[PDB]
């Protein structure tokens, strides 16, 4: 039931992309997508729209002391800039 | 928080926003011509992306719209002098007497207004005459094991009155 | 464009910028359906026992009765003397009393000593 | 401050302000019409119409109703409810 | 109970702030207003309701005549 809820709430038409790359023309792809993807979705279960929340970066450390290992892994990280800003580049 | 269903919808939510912003734009804008200009401007701003097949970007634009609205509301939104919040808010409630009274009068004054009390008595016999069978059978007849709605069906059966109508019909006249 | 409306214990958070209203999961739909069902059944019981033409008295709400009996008579049971209860009891019950006590001692000892000197303005102070 | 409203009069005033509105016609402007079926105009300008009635007569109507008027006859019925129109 | 209905297609809007704001919104490229409503607010016994210092200078119409007569007194 939860699987069917997830399938219902996130396999929706407008959010998703069909894209092809290779030696083929756009008309063929558009017509085949018209003949097959006409009829997936477009409306939610009583408008239960999933929506992003811009979350918060905490900054902390979790250290898993486990000495019976040959090498040690460290990951250090800071804030992400985002996408559309050129600070990305 | 509404009697019909469990929520408004997306559509009516956007709609109530449009009503509120247009009303606040009245309350901001005197002289009525620049009002008319800015109203058509606002309608165009909603016309820019009315036709999104997307939904999640639409509701995100709804939230950012609410931010730029609530930043730009008015200190006195123009409430009408009939609405709650407004200047009236049951202003002439001094005389909004319920009609379970007027039968507890001395029969001198029941002699002062005779025809009215005769027809009022046949009203009460109309009420009690169809109170038990039709009304309570229509209430315990139709719904589910829980009622789960706040509407109620009419009396389409044959004849007499729709159920539970007395305090709907017999109300004050809102200007006595 | 806006510092996102910090709330308070006085400023209510309005209906619009929650922003929890836009994360509609199925649990919120389920909760709103059941909450409408509860309001439906209570208005049904109330309206049927509100429109009876024989019903002379009042409709006698158990909600108001339950609130009142919770508010007054269901205090003293139940209770245990906690650190918070005893601390706030001796603070807000004895603190102001003992404070006002010392300040009236101070004002009275001033005025007694001062008219014991005799240099007060009681040249005509009859209405004592 | 009470000029008496009446059913013919409220019908005439509401149809006067609908007829004054731009993108409809005075031909296919019926009392039993629709704001959804036959005039074909959208929900947006439908609530512009609701705004016109509120701003003419002087009182709000709530949004529990502005979902669901969608025809001029029920407009006249609903101001008949708010005003209790008999002399 | 009669009202006789001072009727439509009579307003014909043309009232100069509404017509010029339909000009400005025409250059804006919208051209879809509410319309011919407010000409009863923009003509009739209306339509250049007088400017503000006119109401203050309204006094000496019968005024200066009486003042010159009392000067002659």
mmCIF file of N, CA and C in Angstrom, chain B residues 9-113:
data_model
loop_
_atom_site.group_PDB
_atom_site.id
_atom_site.type_symbol
_atom_site.label_atom_id
_atom_site.label_comp_id
_atom_site.label_asym_id
_atom_site.label_seq_id
_atom_site.Cartn_x
_atom_site.Cartn_y
_atom_site.Cartn_z
ATOM 1 N N UNK B 9 -9.216 23.948 -2.065
ATOM 2 C CA UNK B 9 -8.559 23.255 -3.170
ATOM 3 C C UNK B 9 -7.395 24.159 -3.502
ATOM 4 N N UNK B 10 -6.600 23.814 -4.508
ATOM 5 C CA UNK B 10 -5.663 24.792 -5.045
ATOM 6 C C UNK B 10 -6.386 25.984 -5.653
ATOM 7 N N UNK B 11 -7.441 25.700 -6.415
ATOM 8 C CA UNK B 11 -8.116 26.681 -7.257
ATOM 9 C C UNK B 11 -8.710 27.809 -6.435
ATOM 10 N N UNK B 12 -9.545 27.451 -5.476
ATOM 11 C CA UNK B 12 -10.194 28.431 -4.636
ATOM 12 C C UNK B 12 -9.214 29.115 -3.701
ATOM 13 N N UNK B 13 -8.096 28.468 -3.380
ATOM 14 C CA UNK B 13 -7.074 29.109 -2.561
ATOM 15 C C UNK B 13 -6.447 30.279 -3.305
ATOM 16 N N UNK B 14 -6.063 30.038 -4.565
ATOM 17 C CA UNK B 14 -5.582 31.103 -5.444
ATOM 18 C C UNK B 14 -6.647 32.164 -5.633
ATOM 19 N N UNK B 15 -7.893 31.729 -5.714
ATOM 20 C CA UNK B 15 -9.003 32.632 -5.947
ATOM 21 C C UNK B 15 -9.207 33.581 -4.773
ATOM 22 N N UNK B 16 -9.169 33.050 -3.550
ATOM 23 C CA UNK B 16 -9.301 33.884 -2.365
ATOM 24 C C UNK B 16 -8.140 34.844 -2.257
ATOM 25 N N UNK B 17 -6.947 34.406 -2.669
ATOM 26 C CA UNK B 17 -5.827 35.341 -2.741
ATOM 27 C C UNK B 17 -6.110 36.472 -3.712
ATOM 28 N N UNK B 18 -6.705 36.156 -4.854
ATOM 29 C CA UNK B 18 -6.956 37.191 -5.845
ATOM 30 C C UNK B 18 -8.001 38.174 -5.357
ATOM 31 N N UNK B 19 -9.019 37.665 -4.664
ATOM 32 C CA UNK B 19 -10.030 38.533 -4.073
ATOM 33 C C UNK B 19 -9.427 39.440 -3.014
ATOM 34 N N UNK B 20 -8.565 38.884 -2.161
ATOM 35 C CA UNK B 20 -7.946 39.671 -1.102
ATOM 36 C C UNK B 20 -7.009 40.728 -1.659
ATOM 37 N N UNK B 21 -6.222 40.383 -2.676
ATOM 38 C CA UNK B 21 -5.270 41.346 -3.212
ATOM 39 C C UNK B 21 -5.983 42.454 -3.956
ATOM 40 N N UNK B 22 -7.061 42.115 -4.658
ATOM 41 C CA UNK B 22 -7.848 43.129 -5.343
ATOM 42 C C UNK B 22 -8.549 44.046 -4.343
ATOM 43 N N UNK B 23 -9.020 43.476 -3.234
ATOM 44 C CA UNK B 23 -9.667 44.265 -2.195
ATOM 45 C C UNK B 23 -8.676 45.178 -1.484
ATOM 46 N N UNK B 24 -7.499 44.653 -1.146
ATOM 47 C CA UNK B 24 -6.442 45.483 -0.586
ATOM 48 C C UNK B 24 -5.990 46.550 -1.554
ATOM 49 N N UNK B 25 -6.069 46.277 -2.849
ATOM 50 C CA UNK B 25 -5.650 47.281 -3.804
ATOM 51 C C UNK B 25 -6.685 48.391 -3.894
ATOM 52 N N UNK B 26 -7.963 48.056 -3.675
ATOM 53 C CA UNK B 26 -8.955 49.098 -3.400
ATOM 54 C C UNK B 26 -8.548 49.917 -2.187
ATOM 55 N N UNK B 27 -8.222 49.242 -1.084
ATOM 56 C CA UNK B 27 -7.966 49.943 0.175
ATOM 57 C C UNK B 27 -6.694 50.769 0.135
ATOM 58 N N UNK B 28 -5.767 50.422 -0.747
ATOM 59 C CA UNK B 28 -4.571 51.220 -0.962
ATOM 60 C C UNK B 28 -4.861 52.376 -1.895
ATOM 61 N N UNK B 29 -5.700 52.140 -2.886
ATOM 62 C CA UNK B 29 -5.738 53.001 -4.047
ATOM 63 C C UNK B 29 -7.074 53.722 -4.119
ATOM 64 N N UNK B 30 -7.051 55.020 -3.866
ATOM 65 C CA UNK B 30 -8.188 55.891 -4.133
ATOM 66 C C UNK B 30 -8.180 56.322 -5.587
ATOM 67 N N UNK B 31 -9.191 57.114 -5.966
ATOM 68 C CA UNK B 31 -9.410 57.854 -7.207
ATOM 69 C C UNK B 31 -9.906 56.985 -8.333
ATOM 70 N N UNK B 32 -9.936 55.661 -8.159
ATOM 71 C CA UNK B 32 -10.691 54.676 -8.928
ATOM 72 C C UNK B 32 -10.174 54.439 -10.355
ATOM 73 N N UNK B 33 -9.435 55.384 -10.912
ATOM 74 C CA UNK B 33 -8.927 55.193 -12.263
ATOM 75 C C UNK B 33 -7.592 54.464 -12.240
ATOM 76 N N UNK B 34 -6.652 54.962 -11.433
ATOM 77 C CA UNK B 34 -5.422 54.246 -11.156
ATOM 78 C C UNK B 34 -5.705 52.911 -10.491
ATOM 79 N N UNK B 35 -6.806 52.833 -9.741
ATOM 80 C CA UNK B 35 -7.318 51.553 -9.282
ATOM 81 C C UNK B 35 -7.623 50.628 -10.438
ATOM 82 N N UNK B 36 -8.318 51.141 -11.448
ATOM 83 C CA UNK B 36 -8.704 50.293 -12.566
ATOM 84 C C UNK B 36 -7.478 49.847 -13.363
ATOM 85 N N UNK B 37 -6.515 50.763 -13.520
ATOM 86 C CA UNK B 37 -5.240 50.459 -14.161
ATOM 87 C C UNK B 37 -4.509 49.337 -13.442
ATOM 88 N N UNK B 38 -4.305 49.500 -12.140
ATOM 89 C CA UNK B 38 -3.539 48.526 -11.381
ATOM 90 C C UNK B 38 -4.273 47.207 -11.253
ATOM 91 N N UNK B 39 -5.597 47.236 -11.319
ATOM 92 C CA UNK B 39 -6.343 45.991 -11.316
ATOM 93 C C UNK B 39 -6.099 45.209 -12.592
ATOM 94 N N UNK B 40 -6.076 45.895 -13.737
ATOM 95 C CA UNK B 40 -5.775 45.172 -14.969
ATOM 96 C C UNK B 40 -4.322 44.707 -15.012
ATOM 97 N N UNK B 41 -3.415 45.483 -14.411
ATOM 98 C CA UNK B 41 -2.024 45.056 -14.284
ATOM 99 C C UNK B 41 -1.897 43.788 -13.459
ATOM 100 N N UNK B 42 -2.643 43.718 -12.361
ATOM 101 C CA UNK B 42 -2.595 42.560 -11.482
ATOM 102 C C UNK B 42 -3.172 41.333 -12.174
ATOM 103 N N UNK B 43 -4.236 41.539 -12.945
ATOM 104 C CA UNK B 43 -4.832 40.454 -13.706
ATOM 105 C C UNK B 43 -3.863 39.934 -14.750
ATOM 106 N N UNK B 44 -3.080 40.830 -15.350
ATOM 107 C CA UNK B 44 -2.055 40.404 -16.301
ATOM 108 C C UNK B 44 -0.953 39.602 -15.619
ATOM 109 N N UNK B 45 -0.569 40.013 -14.406
ATOM 110 C CA UNK B 45 0.446 39.276 -13.663
ATOM 111 C C UNK B 45 -0.027 37.869 -13.314
ATOM 112 N N UNK B 46 -1.322 37.689 -13.081
ATOM 113 C CA UNK B 46 -1.800 36.313 -12.974
ATOM 114 C C UNK B 46 -1.960 35.643 -14.328
ATOM 115 N N UNK B 47 -2.093 36.416 -15.398
ATOM 116 C CA UNK B 47 -2.205 35.811 -16.717
ATOM 117 C C UNK B 47 -0.891 35.300 -17.262
ATOM 118 N N UNK B 48 0.237 35.701 -16.669
ATOM 119 C CA UNK B 48 1.541 35.318 -17.217
ATOM 120 C C UNK B 48 1.751 33.806 -17.205
ATOM 121 N N UNK B 49 1.455 33.154 -16.095
ATOM 122 C CA UNK B 49 1.629 31.713 -15.990
ATOM 123 C C UNK B 49 0.380 31.073 -15.431
ATOM 124 N N UNK B 50 -0.747 31.364 -16.066
ATOM 125 C CA UNK B 50 -1.973 30.666 -15.713
ATOM 126 C C UNK B 50 -1.931 29.225 -16.189
ATOM 127 N N UNK B 51 -1.274 28.973 -17.314
ATOM 128 C CA UNK B 51 -1.422 27.711 -18.031
ATOM 129 C C UNK B 51 -0.234 26.791 -17.798
ATOM 130 N N UNK B 52 0.252 26.715 -16.571
ATOM 131 C CA UNK B 52 1.277 25.733 -16.266
ATOM 132 C C UNK B 52 0.647 24.357 -16.196
ATOM 133 N N UNK B 53 1.138 23.436 -17.023
ATOM 134 C CA UNK B 53 0.805 22.038 -16.808
ATOM 135 C C UNK B 53 1.476 21.505 -15.556
ATOM 136 N N UNK B 54 2.576 22.132 -15.138
ATOM 137 C CA UNK B 54 3.175 21.864 -13.841
ATOM 138 C C UNK B 54 2.207 22.214 -12.723
ATOM 139 N N UNK B 55 2.444 21.625 -11.579
ATOM 140 C CA UNK B 55 1.649 21.911 -10.407
ATOM 141 C C UNK B 55 2.508 22.357 -9.244
ATOM 142 N N UNK B 56 3.687 21.763 -9.105
ATOM 143 C CA UNK B 56 4.533 22.058 -7.963
ATOM 144 C C UNK B 56 5.174 23.434 -8.108
ATOM 145 N N UNK B 57 5.544 23.815 -9.327
ATOM 146 C CA UNK B 57 6.027 25.172 -9.536
ATOM 147 C C UNK B 57 4.899 26.178 -9.363
ATOM 148 N N UNK B 58 3.672 25.772 -9.680
ATOM 149 C CA UNK B 58 2.522 26.644 -9.482
ATOM 150 C C UNK B 58 2.275 26.912 -8.006
ATOM 151 N N UNK B 59 2.322 25.873 -7.174
ATOM 152 C CA UNK B 59 2.066 26.112 -5.761
ATOM 153 C C UNK B 59 3.245 26.801 -5.085
ATOM 154 N N UNK B 60 4.452 26.638 -5.620
ATOM 155 C CA UNK B 60 5.566 27.415 -5.098
ATOM 156 C C UNK B 60 5.426 28.888 -5.459
ATOM 157 N N UNK B 61 4.956 29.173 -6.674
ATOM 158 C CA UNK B 61 4.635 30.547 -7.030
ATOM 159 C C UNK B 61 3.483 31.090 -6.208
ATOM 160 N N UNK B 62 2.570 30.223 -5.778
ATOM 161 C CA UNK B 62 1.525 30.647 -4.856
ATOM 162 C C UNK B 62 2.112 31.103 -3.531
ATOM 163 N N UNK B 63 3.079 30.352 -3.005
ATOM 164 C CA UNK B 63 3.668 30.742 -1.728
ATOM 165 C C UNK B 63 4.464 32.037 -1.846
ATOM 166 N N UNK B 64 5.224 32.193 -2.928
ATOM 167 C CA UNK B 64 5.962 33.442 -3.102
ATOM 168 C C UNK B 64 5.029 34.612 -3.385
ATOM 169 N N UNK B 65 3.874 34.329 -3.978
ATOM 170 C CA UNK B 65 2.849 35.347 -4.117
ATOM 171 C C UNK B 65 2.314 35.778 -2.767
ATOM 172 N N UNK B 66 2.096 34.822 -1.861
ATOM 173 C CA UNK B 66 1.604 35.175 -0.533
ATOM 174 C C UNK B 66 2.614 35.991 0.237
ATOM 175 N N UNK B 67 3.900 35.732 0.018
ATOM 176 C CA UNK B 67 4.920 36.563 0.644
ATOM 177 C C UNK B 67 4.852 37.998 0.128
ATOM 178 N N UNK B 68 4.804 38.183 -1.202
ATOM 179 C CA UNK B 68 4.732 39.561 -1.692
ATOM 180 C C UNK B 68 3.382 40.205 -1.442
ATOM 181 N N UNK B 69 2.353 39.421 -1.169
ATOM 182 C CA UNK B 69 1.088 40.011 -0.764
ATOM 183 C C UNK B 69 1.132 40.479 0.674
ATOM 184 N N UNK B 70 1.552 39.600 1.577
ATOM 185 C CA UNK B 70 1.519 39.926 2.990
ATOM 186 C C UNK B 70 2.521 41.011 3.328
ATOM 187 N N UNK B 71 3.587 41.124 2.545
ATOM 188 C CA UNK B 71 4.434 42.298 2.656
ATOM 189 C C UNK B 71 3.708 43.554 2.203
ATOM 190 N N UNK B 72 2.745 43.423 1.302
ATOM 191 C CA UNK B 72 2.174 44.607 0.704
ATOM 192 C C UNK B 72 0.714 44.839 1.005
ATOM 193 N N UNK B 73 0.227 44.355 2.143
ATOM 194 C CA UNK B 73 -1.179 44.549 2.464
ATOM 195 C C UNK B 73 -1.393 45.958 2.992
ATOM 196 N N UNK B 74 -2.586 46.224 3.443
ATOM 197 C CA UNK B 74 -2.851 47.540 3.943
ATOM 198 C C UNK B 74 -3.045 47.490 5.451
ATOM 199 N N UNK B 75 -2.754 48.579 6.153
ATOM 200 C CA UNK B 75 -3.106 48.631 7.577
ATOM 201 C C UNK B 75 -4.599 48.555 7.848
ATOM 202 N N UNK B 76 -5.431 49.295 7.115
ATOM 203 C CA UNK B 76 -6.875 49.076 7.178
ATOM 204 C C UNK B 76 -7.302 48.544 5.831
ATOM 205 N N UNK B 77 -7.349 47.234 5.659
ATOM 206 C CA UNK B 77 -8.035 46.666 4.504
ATOM 207 C C UNK B 77 -9.481 47.110 4.519
ATOM 208 N N UNK B 78 -10.021 47.376 3.341
ATOM 209 C CA UNK B 78 -11.319 48.021 3.321
ATOM 210 C C UNK B 78 -12.413 46.993 3.519
ATOM 211 N N UNK B 79 -12.797 46.838 4.754
ATOM 212 C CA UNK B 79 -13.887 45.964 5.153
ATOM 213 C C UNK B 79 -15.202 46.715 5.023
ATOM 214 N N UNK B 80 -16.189 46.038 4.509
ATOM 215 C CA UNK B 80 -17.478 46.660 4.302
ATOM 216 C C UNK B 80 -18.234 46.788 5.616
ATOM 217 N N UNK B 81 -19.053 47.815 5.763
ATOM 218 C CA UNK B 81 -19.850 47.998 6.981
ATOM 219 C C UNK B 81 -21.086 47.111 7.056
ATOM 220 N N UNK B 82 -20.921 45.847 6.695
ATOM 221 C CA UNK B 82 -21.856 44.783 6.998
ATOM 222 C C UNK B 82 -21.130 43.538 7.458
ATOM 223 N N UNK B 83 -19.845 43.464 7.263
ATOM 224 C CA UNK B 83 -19.095 42.261 7.520
ATOM 225 C C UNK B 83 -18.631 42.230 8.965
ATOM 226 N N UNK B 84 -18.430 41.042 9.510
ATOM 227 C CA UNK B 84 -17.658 40.926 10.741
ATOM 228 C C UNK B 84 -16.239 41.402 10.520
ATOM 229 N N UNK B 85 -15.720 42.075 11.534
ATOM 230 C CA UNK B 85 -14.551 42.911 11.442
ATOM 231 C C UNK B 85 -14.960 44.337 11.162
ATOM 232 N N UNK B 86 -16.000 44.516 10.357
ATOM 233 C CA UNK B 86 -16.408 45.815 9.881
ATOM 234 C C UNK B 86 -17.104 46.657 10.930
ATOM 235 N N UNK B 87 -17.696 47.744 10.442
ATOM 236 C CA UNK B 87 -18.313 48.736 11.309
ATOM 237 C C UNK B 87 -19.631 48.242 11.891
ATOM 238 N N UNK B 88 -20.351 47.377 11.187
ATOM 239 C CA UNK B 88 -21.644 46.918 11.698
ATOM 240 C C UNK B 88 -21.501 45.756 12.679
ATOM 241 N N UNK B 89 -21.109 44.575 12.176
ATOM 242 C CA UNK B 89 -20.997 43.305 12.908
ATOM 243 C C UNK B 89 -22.197 43.042 13.817
ATOM 244 N N UNK B 90 -23.353 42.786 13.210
ATOM 245 C CA UNK B 90 -24.651 42.707 13.887
ATOM 246 C C UNK B 90 -24.907 43.973 14.697
ATOM 247 N N UNK B 91 -24.993 45.063 13.949
ATOM 248 C CA UNK B 91 -25.119 46.391 14.521
ATOM 249 C C UNK B 91 -26.471 46.562 15.186
ATOM 250 N N UNK B 92 -27.529 46.176 14.485
ATOM 251 C CA UNK B 92 -28.895 46.290 14.984
ATOM 252 C C UNK B 92 -29.357 44.989 15.606
ATOM 253 N N UNK B 93 -28.447 44.346 16.336
ATOM 254 C CA UNK B 93 -28.726 43.166 17.141
ATOM 255 C C UNK B 93 -29.535 43.489 18.391
ATOM 256 N N UNK B 94 -29.785 44.773 18.649
ATOM 257 C CA UNK B 94 -30.654 45.204 19.735
ATOM 258 C C UNK B 94 -32.059 44.643 19.606
ATOM 259 N N UNK B 95 -32.497 44.361 18.390
ATOM 260 C CA UNK B 95 -33.865 43.954 18.161
ATOM 261 C C UNK B 95 -33.956 42.580 17.520
ATOM 262 N N UNK B 96 -32.854 41.829 17.480
ATOM 263 C CA UNK B 96 -32.837 40.507 16.858
ATOM 264 C C UNK B 96 -33.369 39.459 17.832
ATOM 265 N N UNK B 97 -34.644 39.605 18.150
ATOM 266 C CA UNK B 97 -35.284 38.776 19.166
ATOM 267 C C UNK B 97 -35.666 37.441 18.541
ATOM 268 N N UNK B 98 -35.287 36.327 19.141
ATOM 269 C CA UNK B 98 -35.716 35.035 18.626
ATOM 270 C C UNK B 98 -37.189 34.837 18.901
ATOM 271 N N UNK B 99 -37.781 33.958 18.110
ATOM 272 C CA UNK B 99 -39.221 33.823 18.065
ATOM 273 C C UNK B 99 -39.717 32.654 18.871
ATOM 274 N N UNK B 100 -38.877 32.085 19.725
ATOM 275 C CA UNK B 100 -39.448 31.262 20.770
ATOM 276 C C UNK B 100 -40.138 32.112 21.809
ATOM 277 N N UNK B 101 -39.875 33.414 21.822
ATOM 278 C CA UNK B 101 -40.678 34.343 22.587
ATOM 279 C C UNK B 101 -41.963 34.641 21.842
ATOM 280 N N UNK B 102 -42.683 35.679 22.288
ATOM 281 C CA UNK B 102 -43.893 36.240 21.684
ATOM 282 C C UNK B 102 -45.095 35.313 21.855
ATOM 283 N N UNK B 103 -44.861 34.087 22.299
ATOM 284 C CA UNK B 103 -45.921 33.215 22.744
ATOM 285 C C UNK B 103 -46.079 33.262 24.242
ATOM 286 N N UNK B 104 -45.073 33.753 24.944
ATOM 287 C CA UNK B 104 -45.203 33.949 26.377
ATOM 288 C C UNK B 104 -45.683 35.360 26.683
ATOM 289 N N UNK B 105 -46.736 35.775 25.986
ATOM 290 C CA UNK B 105 -47.398 37.043 26.233
ATOM 291 C C UNK B 105 -48.750 36.818 26.876
ATOM 292 N N UNK B 106 -49.168 37.811 27.626
ATOM 293 C CA UNK B 106 -50.471 37.787 28.239
ATOM 294 C C UNK B 106 -51.554 37.884 27.175
ATOM 295 N N UNK B 107 -52.662 37.154 27.337
ATOM 296 C CA UNK B 107 -53.685 37.107 26.286
ATOM 297 C C UNK B 107 -54.418 38.419 26.024
ATOM 298 N N UNK B 108 -54.184 39.478 26.801
ATOM 299 C CA UNK B 108 -54.618 40.797 26.365
ATOM 300 C C UNK B 108 -53.909 41.199 25.081
ATOM 301 N N UNK B 109 -52.591 41.040 25.042
ATOM 302 C CA UNK B 109 -51.885 41.354 23.811
ATOM 303 C C UNK B 109 -52.018 40.264 22.768
ATOM 304 N N UNK B 110 -52.398 39.053 23.167
ATOM 305 C CA UNK B 110 -52.806 38.093 22.157
ATOM 306 C C UNK B 110 -54.174 38.429 21.596
ATOM 307 N N UNK B 111 -54.953 39.240 22.302
ATOM 308 C CA UNK B 111 -56.131 39.833 21.696
ATOM 309 C C UNK B 111 -55.802 41.081 20.897
ATOM 310 N N UNK B 112 -54.681 41.743 21.189
ATOM 311 C CA UNK B 112 -54.325 42.928 20.417
ATOM 312 C C UNK B 112 -53.932 42.592 18.986
ATOM 313 N N UNK B 113 -53.317 41.433 18.755
ATOM 314 C CA UNK B 113 -52.834 41.025 17.432
ATOM 315 C C UNK B 113 -53.376 39.647 17.067
#
